[PDB]
Symmetry: C2
Subunit: 499 residues, 2 copies
């Protein structure tokens, strides 16, 4: 009875439905499992009503990002602020040494740039001759260029370069080296409300099209020119075309046994082998977020980008200087516990400079993400965990130790002391409808496979959309947005041509 | 009577020297290296100044150290004997504007950040694309500004265009003369400042029979005897006959060959004349004029925060309003036209603070065309030079926590003891710095014509005859190795049964 049934109300599904309406097609649905739209785009509220995108926050590749350009046109026409360019010079902090950024002797940023060029030459034309982990690649660089690196450069550079872990959401021993470096097509623009983007799109079509709390449990299309979809409860539907936009990791459940898994869809017939094979090419990263809200800013706003480096040792240097080769370096590196805020790099966005708000938006990676999100309810433990890194930042920013006021006790003796009032944590890895952040590469993965399979679709009536179904903007909000327009337009042309 | 030689190499620059080095390495005997000047090295020349201080007035850096083959050789040497042959002197750039002072790493201007976006803008503009017309670098920057105006602050629109111009000192061409297609490009790793490029020249020169080198002989003509013999005449009248010749004269000097008048210094008369494919290539490639000036001071009495300093050319707010009001590329290109001499603030200038990198109290400054030609044309008037650069020198000292300079060519103040200038645009054996592109230029042409040769016996080498390392010391180096190796392969058959 329906022209098109869109599964999932994330940006992919919403743009699609928005596009269909825009082209005059009627009688369409949008089945969302959650009781809200937005998918991995969620803006939450905390202390004093401040808002934060606990999901996607930035407009990437602003030079060609069509979604951004659309947002730009709007703002150009009405003068309203919808975003801010918050790129800035990064401040790097080592627990013991303090700041190490833009240093007249360490010059870490410069060797970091040679490092990147190194990775490029390494996989250039050879189909990534036996890929390895980002970690293995950095060690190869160090061994090969030690003659031209000082002791401190060999010590801090590898800890600094790991900021890239916050781009992929994966530890450097788990990340594929071939996909580590990417093409930054322009500056980034912090969205001053991705929810505003969600609402504008969400409203571009008939409200009655949306069906929240509809967990699709099975999709089938008996050869008769019709596709039949069923949600968990019991309601059934049928349409001419269907666009599946669930995340990759959820759609990956369709291959295993036990339709018991929350989110998993039952395809009949089963998704063709070219699709199932794609999942063997790894995927799914775990970018997480922790928001630190203070009463007010009493620290320096020199920069909005701050990164704390995991501890490092001088013995590491000695080992590098002495390794005869890659193997000797590998084993020689045998340090045979307990994770702390200094066991991995952490990315903090100082929102005071870019947005005025006195809070820090922090990014974390797997395996830390899963752990921190597991104890998201225990605010006390959370504060104790991050307190040491939160204190080093304040010291490096002309302030002092943080005071714990999550259980407030108004005291005049806090005038110029930073007072923490609330802590917010993401939960993507524990949410059955997301099970992580976005597609990422493990050593040996090939992202293109899935793009082709997804884009080709199960068949003429079963199409796919989402951040894991396109090449440009892969794993990005604008990527999913465009993929949603892709399928809608394809189906939109076909319908017009019939009648 | 004219002496017989297996191979004759014309020119003793690095290309010619590495050619000889390779030939000897492969057991080839009875060769010859003929050089017009009274020294070896060509565009690799280290001079002496105040108190015996040394400076490379030609090439001074090893570029692309991740893959640069000449650099790797020198590094293996230092790794074995522990002698200092080079120093990685890359640093954070200090940018200075005459009115505003330092504008680098500025928390509000963020010039370096949008400069990077510019690079990507340029990259998306050309790279991989077919049928894209070229333009000047200047024009490319104007387009960027117009298209991204909505996301740039007034001060970013004023100063970014002036900072982008540090690239002029990489090509030796003013932004309006420089082809945008050839402006940007990746560098394979950090640069390494040679602590005597002349030490590299000597090592290669000493790696082959010393009786092969014949300095002070300017070659006037090359003739191919249709019988496997090439006749070469020196100006002093000596005549030679060789099986092969490797011609490494600068591209600007070889260009004289395709013109009437054989009395110009360095010109070679070719019989038969250079094939049509070669002459014609001279239209699709040009020559830039990177130039230098060494300012020697008594002692360092200034901040050593960085070894890299760049003074931007003056800018105006009227430029901003025009960019803001422009309605399109045409209006902007038009609006940009008003109603006046050249000073040290009319173009960007690059200064290398040697005190930090080498501990020597001097500045090595790079200049570009057209300024280069004008400054070299007065290198003799030292007072005129000091007056011309005094304002930028003062501004730099102020920014490095010091005071105005004191003319001391005749306590805590900087005293200029000497000024040294380059002479490449005037030296008839150079006629400029190195190969460069003007909008519409296609360097691939010359490389192909040169690497293909005049014929089987008449070959070419030099910085203008190869892609990888084009314009660089290691490109000329490799090109020499290439022609020598080819000749060795051919002479190999001489021992087949
Ligand atoms: C912490 C974090 C930070 C990020 N930051 C950025 C950033 O700064 N910039 C950027 O560009 N991208 C960012 N991303 C990625 C971006 O959020 C995603 O690419 C994008 O939201 C994916 O859109 P989508 O429409 O495909 O799916 P949305 O999740 O992304 O999901 C599709 C919809 O399917 C629904 N669904 C799932 N299972 C079922 C079922 N069985 N039945 C019915 N409905 C179902 C879901 O509930 C969901 O609403 C970030 C992601 C994370 C996790
Ligand atoms: C100011 C300046 C700065 C530079 N800086 C760098 C740098 O930092 N890094 C880098 O890699 N490169 C740099 N270069 C470029 C580098 O110096 C050249 O690429 C390289 O030296 C060219 O070598 P060549 O052997 O081809 O020619 P050499 O000049 O370059 O010339 C070949 C030889 O031919 C001789 N000759 C000419 N005509 C005749 C004739 N008729 N008879 C006999 N002999 C003749 C000449 O006298 C000369 O010795 C710079 C160049 C200049 C001008």
């Amino acid at each position: 009875k329906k022209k098109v049934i869109i599964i999932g109300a994330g940006i992919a599904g919403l743009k699609a439905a928005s596009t269909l309406h825009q082209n005059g097609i009627q009688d369409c649905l949008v089945l969302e499992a959650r009781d809200r739209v937005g998918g991995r785009l969620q803006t939450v509220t905390g202390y004093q009503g401040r808002k934060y995108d606990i999901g996607a926050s930035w407009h990437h590749d602003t030079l060609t990002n069509p979604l951004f350009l659309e947002e730009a046109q709007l703002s150009l026409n009405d003068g309203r602020t919808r975003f801010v360019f918050d790129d800035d010079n990064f401040i790097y902090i080592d627990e013991e040494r303090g700041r190490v950024d833009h240093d007249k002797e360490l010059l870490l940023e410069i060797v970091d740039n040679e490092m990147s060029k190194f990775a490029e030459l390494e996989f250039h034309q050879h189909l990534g001759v036996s890929d390895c982990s980002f970690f293995q690649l950095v060690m190869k660089y160090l061994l090969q260029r030690r003659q031209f690196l000082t002791n401190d450069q060999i010590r801090y550079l590898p800890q600094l370069c790991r900021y890239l872990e916050l781009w992929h959401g994966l530890d450097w021993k788990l990340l594929s080296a071939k996909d580590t470096y990417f093409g930054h097509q322009g500056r980034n623009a912090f969205a001053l409300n991705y929810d505003s983007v969600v609402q504008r799109i969400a409203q571009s079509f008939p409200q009655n099209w949306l069906k929240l709390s509809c967990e699709v449990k099975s999709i089938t299309r008996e050869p008769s020119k019709n596709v039949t979809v069923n949600c968990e409860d019991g309601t059934v539907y049928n349409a001419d075309y269907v666009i599946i936009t669930v995340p990759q990791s959820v759609l990956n459940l369709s291959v295993q046994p036990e339709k018991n898994l929350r989110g998993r869809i039952e395809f009949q017939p089963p998704l063709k082998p070219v699709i199932q094979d794609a999942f063997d090419k790894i995927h799914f990263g775990a970018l997480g977020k922790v928001i630190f809200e203070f009463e007010e800013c009493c620290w320096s706003n020199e920069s909005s980008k701050i990164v704390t480096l995991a501890n490092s040792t001088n013995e590491f240097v000695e080992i590098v200087r002495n390794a005869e080769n890659l193997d000797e370096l590998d084993s020689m590196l045998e340090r045979e516990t307990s994770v702390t805020c200094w066991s991995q790099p952490l990315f903090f966005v100082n929102l005071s400079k870019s947005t005025g708000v006195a809070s820090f938006m922090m990014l974390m990676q797997a395996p830390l993400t899963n752990h921190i999100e597991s104890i998201r309810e225990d605010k006390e433990r959370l504060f104790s965990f991050f307190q040491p890194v939160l204190n080093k930042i304040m010291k490096c920013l002309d302030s002092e130790d943080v005071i714990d006021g999550m259980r407030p006790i108004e005291n005049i003796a806090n005038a110029n002391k930073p007072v923490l009032r609330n802590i917010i944590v993401s939960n993507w890895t524990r949410d059955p409808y997301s099970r992580g952040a976005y597609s990422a590469c493990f050593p040996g993965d090939d992202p293109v496979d899935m793009v082709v399979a997804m884009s080709n679709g199960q068949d003429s009536r079963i199409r796919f959309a989402g951040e894991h179904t396109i090449m440009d903007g892969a794993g990005c909000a604008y990527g999913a947005w465009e993929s949603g327009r892709r399928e809608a337009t394809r189906i939109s042309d076909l319908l017009k041509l019939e009648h």
